[model samples]
Target: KLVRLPGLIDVHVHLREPGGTHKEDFASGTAAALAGGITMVCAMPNTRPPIIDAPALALAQKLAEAGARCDFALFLGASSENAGTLGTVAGSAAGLKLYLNETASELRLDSVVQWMEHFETWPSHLPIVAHAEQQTVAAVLMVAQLTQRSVHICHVARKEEILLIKAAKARGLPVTCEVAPHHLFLSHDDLERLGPGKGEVRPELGSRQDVEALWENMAVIDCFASDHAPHTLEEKCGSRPPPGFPGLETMLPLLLTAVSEGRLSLDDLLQRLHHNPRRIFHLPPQEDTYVEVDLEHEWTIPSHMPFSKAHWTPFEGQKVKGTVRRVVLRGEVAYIDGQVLVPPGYGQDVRKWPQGAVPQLP
Candidate 1:
């Protein structure tokens, strides 16, 4: 019997709710997470009505608890309008989200310093997860210095940016970074070959050399997040494709494939995919939510098999070895032998940043 570890937790995912359900919703998104052996997920708050305030954050928490099939948590947005309100809504959030560059909506970096100060003074010392892009690495560092808050950089895809993250860590700042599976496995060359059909995201997929640098710095990187953004086939390939490709379901398989090929050791894979996320996000260790994978088992990624509403993935039709054999959530069997055992609405909310940690807010 393969001994199952605790359920996988995806610290960053866009489960378009309170707005873009046509493309993906909490129910469908959580189902996908369950299928992929991820028992808990922390969703970004950039929905139709951004979760920028207490009421908005509360609504998201309620909706996720009501609609999700897997356990989930919501991140509060740090928009300029709501920067001062972050403290009021701190209890209801996993952390604060800052868009350093323009992405899904209009949240730019005009008031990053002010917002960081607010975060530094907020109760609970919740993490500040930043979409750290744009040309202001220096500016981000300045804000980080003033806030003294633990920062998580989302999706470090560029080679040069890795150096900045390292420097931030070297300064003894409480800074960490996450790298997506696509950034570690695929390169810009795949983009040129697939064209717009593959779907592109900001800080665009980097070169093969960039992927190498990411893995090279893997020793210092804190965690690996899917950043599972989804879009329909029509929306992904039409005149204007969506910003990202579906990733929730394919995240584990791609990483396991790397293990099967000897590119990454099993211990390193476990740390990057499971241990680090829990430590950084402060998720409690649940004995029942663990999953076990049969390293010897092999499977192929089918083009049509998708649990998310958006059925497209960049890793489609690729053969990968190793498979998840069983998943247990809160001591209940969620997935077993490649079949999902738990029905819809079985997933629950995971606590944000644990319970007792103190954060320093400005």
Candidate 2:
């Protein structure tokens, strides 16, 4: 009982390049993303040469265009110190990524006059994706309210944060959000399996209550992203683990497994995984963008997939039903039956989707 859905769009992936290729690179990362049916992805700016200013963004963009196997968008990280330069480079990025908690980049803060003026510089439809949690999420939403800027709260994992996003949406604030696969699929109880490096992640995993709350109000959650932050296998499993895991290869199958479990409907999954992401990120519909899966197959997350330099998965050997069988991008089969058919440089640069672009599914 396999099914197909529009190629997934991941708006929060870390394709470590320019500085962190030892973990993952555009070539391998996008190939893995394609195998999971992600035809498009937005790269977060926290690499060796973070996309803070225009030059850095340009360099990353060039690198992506030259090496990526799927459509891509790159964001610029916002720092209190780089606001002036950030304002100048803001137009080139898909959006600005602000970090309020501990992660790759150390950027932070919020305010009335200064923040309002700060957000006013973005182009229409450009969103501010904030890496904030709990109380910090509210603060980001507050700034969105005051400045009237578009905002997206990333990897929200608490019941309180969900309510805040719900209320903000009720008020019709220009807001959107994404819940990563890790947050939706893994809970704090799984920490035992994760141990040392494997369990590490930003915003951390949540309690069973937090995970349940997300599914309870799944409609409030705008989209689903893998946040596929990869690190070298040695780094993740070692005593000093980097805070991420390779997720692009698991994003779609995990959700399909949820459908098999009766936790969510296929239509609902389509909205969150395909339509909503394209609408919010302004990714135009592509030709023949779809992925097929095997709903009846029993499988486990890979222990030996070569699509990422980071070779292991937190979900290693965890049995689940549903596996991706094929992926089509722009009317061509980019991946099929476990083989990558497309090569690097075949992907389009979809960072700047023009107006009147409606998402179409075939």
Candidate 3:
């Protein structure tokens, strides 16, 4: 049976442009998004040069404008050096991203003072997204309380963290968090199947109990972000694989399979994928955007070919029910069957839209 759903939104994805195009680029990454029924993606900013300042944001905008296949937005990474100047470009980015833990990049803010600098300087209306894991989640929330600014936690994966977030919300902290599909579906035991390091991802896969906790505390999760960080098969299979997984194309089907099994409600899925992301990001409406899914279709994920340039997935061989047959963005057929109908440069920066305005076909 075919069902029409509002086009999905993924707030955390790594398009690997500006410097890491070898793994993925705007064209391939956003193509992967459409294939999975995602109409819009908020690209992360952990590239080689990183999208930390005006010049870097401009470069990212130029590349995405020229090559992206769907609607897109670029995030600005917060660094100690760029803290004071971040406010200048607040209007252009999806939000300010803080790498408070796990990441070794220059954007990782190790000092509370640096976090304060960003919290104090960034505009309150725009969001502050953080890569905070475990105790770092508490730290970021504490800062949010102190500064009276809101924060969004990316890819939360642990019982302790989610419980803490639940408590924080009960106390009225303006904090939100997302759960990645990998965290919900895969765990450390699956590492043997993925081989060593192939399952590597930031925040890492947790125990089965951790996955259970995520499902148990589902009410606390505000968004379902793919965190589609792609890495090449050669790199992932090597001895020292950089941590990440290619997730954009597989997230929806995995969740849909769960829905078929009665593990999740379609209402819950829509709230996280559409309503919550739009509310959190202040995104402009994608007028006429929606996805058609064949709810009873069942298929095995291929290891050889996904729209992502990474060309591999940890979900390879997993059987899933439901699949995206087509996507409509701004009233245009962007993806149908296996083909992407839109040309490069078809997507627009969502940040440029006037608040609450529905986009017109451009």
Candidate 4:
């Protein structure tokens, strides 16, 4: 069967490790990535002790090397306090991750001007991945315009957010953005459905009208990511619910279901899942990495048998038309059918974005 396709690349994912092992770890997290048809994953840096400096980045990279199962790239978290250390990840890691919204870290900066103003001093070559809402969208874009550097917005859920990004692109600013599976498929209408779980994720789900706008203006978007923040059942079920949901295993099936329903073309899905991520992040193609999607086979998003230690997903009970039958990581078949075959050290650090090779504005 010639059904093999370039593996999906998820740019925003919170695979907890180096700290919160009860919730998740690198081994289980990347196993989830393999099962989800993802050939590459950029690990978020919001763990117990946030990865803010060069020492922390090195430690996190070391942990992933010992445990990850797929091609991996790590993000260095940025904060107002750590701007001095930005040079540590300037050319080595994935990119700098900015939390404009509230997170577990002290890095949260509510002042739009404060965050964007800092971007002016932040150098290029190392692109920026910002967690911005509609309220703070244009601030980052304005900074990008002033600095002429690349900026990537993460997990956009509101119409106003994308609208601002679209106008920024029209002005030839070097800005790119991604939308999450939940933002595309679920809405505020799902608030009651997800219950306490809805209250946890930052930038909360958007109105149904906002979701419709995302699909309608999908052309302006660059990549599709899970923003895969997995939480344990107890943590996600309590009144507080904690924030985040699992996706490394269900994102592709849901997107594939969208293709089966004619919501998005297969080529369009490929661009969002494979081609665009590689382009925006300056990652090389994984010639030996691929996945097999059995479109004819149908299945539900697994909740109990998933690779995530959390063992739960917001997409639980959702039925889909396709399934990932095989996953090739680097040059090895780490997962096939329903079995995981890779060992702890099979994964290696992905190519880094060298200095002066910044991607062009779209």
Candidate 5:
């Protein structure tokens, strides 16, 4: 019942550093990733100061180098103010992140002109990741087509959004998109149970119909990202809570459960979790790194998680099949049976990995 998976990759995670370390930092965030069988994670740029320029990007990279335990990459936030100069530091970032809608931070770009400016200016080699929802999806796609650049849509939730992305790919518009596990599993039906404050998330949870549409159009989903945005328990239960979930540790088991029930194929899970993210992000293969899972293991999701400062999960108490028993990072045992063996600073920036290089298997 044990299975070995290529070191998994989560292309969307929010490791709040330099500004919101109280929520989660590089050390805690990467530890959670290893526990979830993720070896490399691409962090989003919407932190306290936000990584819009070279200085902010350098600060994040330094902190991550000093603390992260798994391989990682950082995203540079794109805004109307910094669009013109992003190309100056393009080599340091995994990709440029465009916030085309409302998010936890005030880093939103609502005009088509701003979108065009970024699409036209960013280096064509790296993808411009977008936090586009609903109507904004089409807006970004239009800009990408016009400018002839690759665009990646983050956290697609509704049927209309996925359908639109499907159509875009059919036309071969250099478009790619990802779906979060919360959108694929939970829905509006669980809002009351998750509570008014806890149920709140950006793009919000969709109806049961929307959930079915995601599963129905699974082929259209290029990657499965945790969007592993974490917030403390108090912040989550506060009168006006932020919209995000602690997903790094919950993603794999949920998908593995689906695989067991015939709801998802193991092949598709690997493609979304490993192959696709690696291809889209231009990440190099992990040398002697992989995850060992006991597919037959059954367990209930815990309400509190120690690795993340968030301390609580929206998926508390859910029964899930399969568990990550061990994780090997660069030929070293990084995580095993609920423990992270590697210390802080063990992780390396994945963007530094050389292209055309293959894993030197042990």
Candidate 6:
């Protein structure tokens, strides 16, 4: 008998809403999450209007409530123009999202201190989640020092950056880090095989030694988040654009395969994928919300099976060892035996964190 663990929560996902629907939208994105056994997802606020202020936040919340198929939360974007309005944005979000590098919405190091000071005034201990691919390691260190608040590093791609995070943790700072399934499984060699501009990010994919270091540091990292950035095949293959790979469907299977190969322990998998994220986001421990994986089942990822609008994925044609047999959300079987049993809109907003006790930062 396979035991189901509590529901999976992806703290970092780009579910383009209020704009970019041609790429992805709340309905399609959450449907993809539910199919992948993800009961909850916190979408970044880089939409057209850039969910940097109260109006944008409300719009996002309304969209999710009206159209999403799974529980969702919003991440308030922190930009130079919105820094002063952090509290207003924070009131409607789980935390402040800082893009330390060039993303769809541009944010740079010069604005870090201002945003940090704004977050420091929040009455509750809301975290500052950073996409920490700064130009230099010193920039990352500087942000950590200035924030001095509970911070979550998103998609930790570089080994040196992981080491820096480890060193910071050793100093008793309230910092946690997340690694994507792609970074854990694929290396720069995969990039070479996939060709130029594939899987590229700022402070780009590193050497084999870096990959080895990342694996070694996984024992200490806080969580495993599927950045799960999705883009259309045309956009991905366009003349000057980089490829953004889909991962929600492959995250659990890849992690389970790693466990089967003895690369990671089941305890570590559970901690990173389930427990750690719960603690970080302050989600309550509930028995009914969970996902079941049949480790004995073998499956091959199909190129066109993605539920997201952009059906393209990086792990297409890869054979994974395990298959998700069922997904239970809030006491009901949402998906079972590779088929969706619950209709769309059955999933509800996970307000446990927002209503629960707050964590004290030292």
Candidate 1 lDDT, tens digit per residue, 1-362?
Answer: 46455678888899999888987899888878877778889899888788877877777877887788778778887776665566655755677788877665645547666656556665545777888763555567677777655677888887787878887778787788888888887787777655766646765788899989988888766777888888787887788776776788888878878877988787787787788887777666665568787666667777645578888677766778766777778778877765677766676666643542333466
RMSD of 6: 2.7
My TM-score estimates for the predictions, one after another, are 0.91, 0.92, 0.96, 0.93, 0.96, 0.90
lDDT of 2 by residue, 1-362 (tens): 65877787888899998789988899999998988778888899888888777888888888998889998878888766576556555655667787877554545454444455456665445667888888888877777776666888888778888988998889888888889888888889899988857888887888999999999989899888888899877887787777887888888888888998999888888898789887776767777788888899988776756587788777777678878888888888899878889888877667455632323353
Q: What local lDDT does model 1 show for residue 116? A: 68
Decoy 1 TM-score against native = 0.91
Task: Return model 1's CA RMSD, one decimal.
Answer: 2.6
Give the per-residue Cα lDDT of candidate 1 at 8: 82
Error of 1 at 114 (Å): 4.1
User: Candidate 3, which segments miss by more than 4 Å at Cα?
Assistant: 356-362
What does candidate 4's lDDT look like per residue over 67-169, in tens digits? Answer: 8888778888877677655663656677888887766576676566656655765566566899878767777767666766788999988989988888877
TM-score (C-alpha) between model 4 and the true structure: 0.93
Candidate 1 backbone overlaps, count: 16
User: Can you tell me which runs of candidate 6 are displaced by over 4 Å?
Assistant: 104-110, 119-124, 134-138, 201-203, 352-362
CA lDDT, every model vs. true structure = 0.75, 0.80, 0.89, 0.80, 0.89, 0.73
Alpha-carbon shift of residue 43 in model 1 (angstroms): 0.6
Which pairs of residues clash in candidate 4, taking residues 3 or more apart in a chain or in different chains?
none
Estimate candidate 2's alpha-carbon lDDT, on a 0 to 1 scale: 0.80
**Could you tell me how far off, in angstroms, the CA of residue 11 lies in candidate 1 after the best superposition?**
0.3
For 1-362, candidate 3 gives per-residue lDDT tens digits of 68899989999999999899989999999999999999999999998789988988888999999989898888999986888897668768888899987667878776898999899988877878999999999998989888998999999999999999999999988899999999999998898899877878988999999999999999999999999988898899897899999999999999999999998899999999999999888887788999999889899988844589888998888899989998999989999998989988898888777763323243
Please give the TM-score that candidate 5 achieves against the real structure: 0.96
lDDT of 3: 0.89
Q: Count the backbone clashes (under 3 Å) in each candidate.
A: 16, 0, 0, 0, 0, 0
lDDT of 6 at 40: 83
